[PDB]
Ligand binder design. Structure first.
Ligand SMILES: Cc1cn([C@H]2C[C@H](O)[C@@H](COP(=O)(O)OP(=O)(O)OP(=O)(O)O)O2)c(=O)[nH]c1=O
Length: 401
């Protein structure tokens, strides 16, 4: 059985994280998204895995994934439909979207046993975003309704398919279309008139990593569900630990440090002295958290350092970031309203009263920097000491005012 991961999306809604990595390499605790997917696939006896990527990202994928075929999507076309056109199979294949996290492989294991075309649907609370699944009387797929702005059903396209080579006959009939785009669900929509498409309801945890605060969402779920309290590191005297704490190998936790779990402390991390890690602190790898630094409900990616006199709450900080002493992130607005975030040029409500900042890779802040709620700082940005970052900062930009 072959599998294809469609990982050639533009990842613009996930900026600034995607300034320096594909969405497929977003960390959930210590491992990137795609590594969970490959793991699940392999667990179900699928070893011939192909990732379809943008040409821009081919190099990045080749360098990270040794036993996986990488194929580039045709340059001149876009969409989930265009991605499968580089998928080479006869006979059938498992197809999965490259930004999906889900809790287990059980459904993939089941779906590959089936002769029929099959799709997984999952119930959301915001179906109007998302492809809604309309079932017929026999509970097979009637049609997929794309972003209706009306809820016919809870049940939406989970982006996990087992499709037969049919699917290409229908991709050729497809006229595409109102987004400038070749859409897989359009082809599926034709095919389901002629062929039976089973729908299997996914029951566990599912989430697409679409927007930056979803990085916090999934990492919080993973910490609660996938790992157990352990200490493989070095914890000095007078460190207080409550609740579930994962201390990975080579992590060092100095005296005066206070930890209220659940907290994930990635390998090679250096904590303290006199740090405060609050619930849902996730330090992916090789992180430094120093004296009079408090972290709460944040994901702080590989090699990033917050060495002095800082508060980081409800935030995502990408890799190799350095915070000057006294850099502070606000997570609550003066008017205490839902924090809005600029996402692909639209002002989007995050759904969160408390939300901090989203910091791209290799950013450095000068001392005493102030960052407002919902702010995005582009990768490689440099923030002048004492600056008040009251708006988004572009990729690679110096910011003073
Ligand atoms: C998954 C996938 C998406 N796409 C395209 C179709 C759309 O233009 C866009 C939407 O996919 P989405 O899953 O909606 O998210 P995204 O990362 O791809 O896009 P965005 O910039 O909005 O964050 O990406 C591909 O070209 N190839 C692919 O393999």
């Amino acid at each position: 059985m072959k599998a294809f991961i469609l990982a050639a999306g533009s990842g613009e809604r996930l900026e600034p994280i995607t300034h320096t990595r594909p969405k497929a390499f977003v960390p959930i605790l210590s491992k990137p998204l795609i590594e969970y997917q490959i793991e699940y696939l392999r667990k179900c006896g699928i070893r011939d895995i192909t990732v379809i990527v943008s040409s821009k990202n081919k190099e990045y994928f080749e360098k990270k994934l040794k036993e996986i075929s990488i194929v580039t999507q045709k340059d001149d076309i876009k969409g989930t439909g265009a991605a499968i056109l580089s998928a080479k199979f006869n006979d059938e294949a498992l197809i999965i979207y490259g930004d999906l996290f889900f809790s287990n492989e059980k459904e993939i294991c089941n779906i590959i046993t089936l002769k029929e075309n099959a799709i997984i649907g999952v119930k959301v609370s915001n179906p109007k975003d998302y492809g809604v699944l309309v079932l017929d009387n026999q509970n097979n797929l009637s049609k997929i309704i794309e972003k209706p702005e009306i809820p016919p059903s809870n049940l939406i396209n989970a982006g996990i398919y087992k499709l037969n080579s049919d699917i290409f006959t229908y991709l050729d009939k497809i006229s595409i279309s109102e987004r400038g785009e070749l859409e897989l669900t359009d082809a599926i929509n034709l095919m389901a008139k002629d062929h039976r498409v089973k729908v299997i309801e996914y029951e566990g945890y599912w989430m697409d990593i679409g927007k930056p605060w979803n990085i916090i969402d999934v990492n919080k779920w993973a910490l609660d569900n996938l790992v157990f309290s352990q200490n493989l590191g070095n914890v000095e005297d007078n460190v207080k630990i409550k609740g579930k704490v994962i201390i990975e190998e080579d992590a060092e936790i100095k005296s005066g440090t206070y930890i209220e779990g659940p907290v994930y402390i990635g390998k090679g991390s250096e904590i303290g002295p006199n740090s405060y890690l609050r619930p849902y602190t996730i330090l992916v790898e090789k992180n430094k958290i120093g004296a009079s630094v408090e972290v709460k409900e944040s994901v702080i990616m590989e090699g990033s350092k917050i060495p002095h006199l800082s508060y980081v709450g409800d935030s995502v900080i990408a890799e190799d970031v350095n915070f000057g002493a006294g850099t502070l992130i606000a997570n609550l607005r003066f008017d205490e309203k839902e924090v809005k975030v600029n996402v692909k040029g639209k002002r989007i409500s995050s759904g969160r009263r408390k939300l901090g900042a989203f910091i791209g890779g290799h950013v450095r802040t000068g001392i005493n920097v102030t960052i407002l709620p919902g702010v995005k700082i582009g990768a490689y940005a440099r923030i002048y000491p004492g600056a008040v970052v009251n708006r988004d900062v572009g990729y690679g930009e110096f910011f003073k005012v």
